[PDB]
Amino acid sequence: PVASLSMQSHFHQRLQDENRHSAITRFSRTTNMGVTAMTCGGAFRMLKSGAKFSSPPHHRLNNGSFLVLPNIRVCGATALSSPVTVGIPSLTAFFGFVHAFERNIN
């Protein structure tokens, strides 16, 4: 996977109004990454939820082969997953976790 400066400009420009979703990520240092980084040197704003966690109900009620795994705690994960969003990780990370688990246990 690689990055598109065109998608970076699309996801860049609109959020200047909405600073509630601003996540300033200054990069390598603006010498050799490219002039598209020199254009917005310092800001590099990206997408985040704009609100913290909350309190849900897990369930209101009370195939098969349901294998139950509680209380997985992940410290030091990856939040900058896409080039443009900042928040929860990828779903291909969870897919790779599950596929590595079955390729162990088979």
Added chain:
RNA sequence: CUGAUAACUUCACGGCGGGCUUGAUGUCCGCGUCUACCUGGUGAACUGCCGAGUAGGUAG
């Protein structure tokens, strides 16, 4: 088979000095709670003697 594998940010740090919130103030008038009403001991711990003795000891 996880934008793959690896990845010690840290050391020091005196927000202090001063300060009159007060003046005045009629809440009141009126007011019928009433009618009715079975808690029961089945028969169920007796008859005597001594003690001057509502106290006190006896025999069965």
